[PDB]
Amino acid sequence: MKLNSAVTASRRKCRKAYFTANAETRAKMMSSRLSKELRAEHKIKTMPIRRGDIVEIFTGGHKGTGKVVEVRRRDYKICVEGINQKARNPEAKPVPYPIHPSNCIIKELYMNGSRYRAIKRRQERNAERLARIGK
């Protein structure tokens, strides 16, 4: 149950916020769970999805694995190579089938200096959280 009176629980307001979010909020809302092996390596659960990493689709009619080749931020959809609509002819450029990030698992992440710094920033902040509860 919510106790913060400054946060709205109105359906109309929540949906309006969802449909008119700015760029960074949209990016954060497009996260996927990390695999068990990646969870052990970095002590985090989810990661914003980015072009260049590998995912596994675990639900829907287009299950599979592939590399992320495009992010459509104003639809909340991604295109992964090899997941296409069935073609009318064998000679036509494939049409990707857009997929929501919340039904895939990240298998391997494309690594940057900025990604490293962001992950390290994340870990050092839930370390305080864990130190402040339990143990």
């Binding site: 149950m1 629980a9 109105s10 359906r11």
Partner: protein, 211 residues
């Protein structure tokens, strides 16, 4: 609303009805015209509240409390109390801050079937209202009454459960939907104090028992 346009009646003699019209001839203003005002528009000066004497409020709360200790009424209302030892149910719980411990107690006193009754009944409401911030509905569970004890944090998140301090019991919680017999879990201190919370109502006498 309905009176921001300029509209005046044409008279008789043009083969049209006598209501007010806009410059192009569109009907306006009347309650049977598209775009007009209400015949009697609703107003905020309506009386929204009602007055009840203090004596009758006290009588109602006392009678609902007395109904809560009847077992037959508690069963007639919706409650699964086959496994409950006694009515009233009094439990010495000390302080509970983890939901797991609250669930342990709930299972110990044989009241878990009423919590599961509510936990499995969540569904989406019919009609309008689901788009007015009233989307979900659940059944009503047991009510916990405490006093000088910390049980709220443990009991807050159990579906169907409601909490009350013993010095300010709410009537809308004793008789949900206007039906009086609700299952109550008392802490020991709450029962002992209720013994004399009624002695602090100055110059108040409990109504006499009858056959």
């Amino acid at each position: 609303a309905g009176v921001q346009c300029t509209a005046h009646s044409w008279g008789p003699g043009r083969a049209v009805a006598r209501l007010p019209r806009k410059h192009g001839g569109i009907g306006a203003y009347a309650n049977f015209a598209r775009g007009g005002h209400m015949a009697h528009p609703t107003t905020v000066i309506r009386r929204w509240c009602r007055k009840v004497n203090l004596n009758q409020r006290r009588y109602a709360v006392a009678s609902a409390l007395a109904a809560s200790a009847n077992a037959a009424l508690v069963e007639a209302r919706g409650h699964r109390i086959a496994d409950v030892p006694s009515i009233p149910l009094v439990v010495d719980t000390d302080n509970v801050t983890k939901t797991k411990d609250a669930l342990a107690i709930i299972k110990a006193v044989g009241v878990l079937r009423d919590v599961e009754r509510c936990k499995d009944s969540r569904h989406i409401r019919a009609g309008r209202g689901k788009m007015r911030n009233r989307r979900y509905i659940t059944r009503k569970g047991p009510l916990v009454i405490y006093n000088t004890e910390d049980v709220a944090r443990g009991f807050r998140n159990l579906p169907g459960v409601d909490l009350c301090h013993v010095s300010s019991i709410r009537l809308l919680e004793l008789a949900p939907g206007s039906h009086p017999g609700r299952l109550i879990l008392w802490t020991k201190s709450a029962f002992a104090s209720l013994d004399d919370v009624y002695a602090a109502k100055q110059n108040y006498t409990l109504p006499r028992s009858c056959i």
